[PDB]
Design an enzyme around this catalytic site. Structure first.
Site, PDB file in Angstrom:
ATOM      1  CE1 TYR A 173      31.582  39.282  36.960  1.00  0.00           C
ATOM      2  CE2 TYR A 173      31.839  36.945  36.532  1.00  0.00           C
ATOM      3  CZ  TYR A 173      31.528  38.206  36.130  1.00  0.00           C
ATOM      4  OH  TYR A 173      31.147  38.400  34.839  1.00  0.00           O
TER       5      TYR A 173
ATOM      6  CG  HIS B 246      34.061  40.480  31.796  1.00  0.00           C
ATOM      7  ND1 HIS B 246      35.219  39.760  31.561  1.00  0.00           N
ATOM      8  CD2 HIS B 246      34.431  41.585  32.505  1.00  0.00           C
ATOM      9  CE1 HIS B 246      36.235  40.412  32.110  1.00  0.00           C
ATOM     10  NE2 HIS B 246      35.744  41.542  32.694  1.00  0.00           N
TER      11      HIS B 246
END
Length: 118
Positions: free
Chosen positions: A100, A56
Site C-alpha cells: 500500500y 487514511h
C-alpha cells in the site's frame, strides 16, 4: 462483557467525512505519544463516493502497540471546536503495508519504515 483492546504493530485510522488535513493529523499523530515507538507514518487522503471527505492513516511502531483506547487517536479541529473519533484498525498483515505504501499519490510521508526480517 469485554473491552476494546487492539494489539498490532500496524494501525490504520479512518476518518469519515473528516475535513481534517494530513498536516493536522500528521502533527497530532506525530505529536501523539505511544507506549512503543513511532517509526514510519503514512497519511493519505481519500474522498468517498458519497461526496464525503475521508482520510487514511497508516502508522507502524517498532513494537506491537496496544490500542485499547480510542482516546489516543482522538483528533480534533485546531480551527473548529469539533472533535473527531477515528476508527482504529489492526493490520493483520505485515509487508502488505509496503504494498500500500507503494500506492503513493498526494500523500504525506513521515518517518522511515523498516521491515524487521525477510
Amino acid at each position: 462483557s469485554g473491552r476494546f483492546s487492539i494489539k498490532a504493530k500496524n494501525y490504520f485510522l479512518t476518518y469519515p467525512k473528516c475535513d481534517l488535513t494530513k498536516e493536522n493529523a500528521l502533527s497530532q499523530i506525530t505529536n501523539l505519544q505511544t507506549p512503543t515507538n513511532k517509526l514510519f507514518i503514512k497519511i493519505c487522503r481519500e474522498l468517498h463516493e458519497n461526496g464525503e471527505p475521508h482520510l487514511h492513516i497508516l502508522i507502524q511502531f517498532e513494537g506491537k502497540y496496544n490500542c485499547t483506547n480510542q482516546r489516543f487517536f482522538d483528533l480534533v479541529s485546531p480551527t473548529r471546536s469539533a472533535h473527531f473519533h477515528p476508527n482504529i484498525q489492526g493490520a493483520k498483515s505485515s509487508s502488505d503495508v509496503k504494498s500500500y505504501i507503494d500506492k503513493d499519490g498526494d500523500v504525506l510521508e513521515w518517518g522511515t519504515f523498516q521491515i524487521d526480517g525477510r
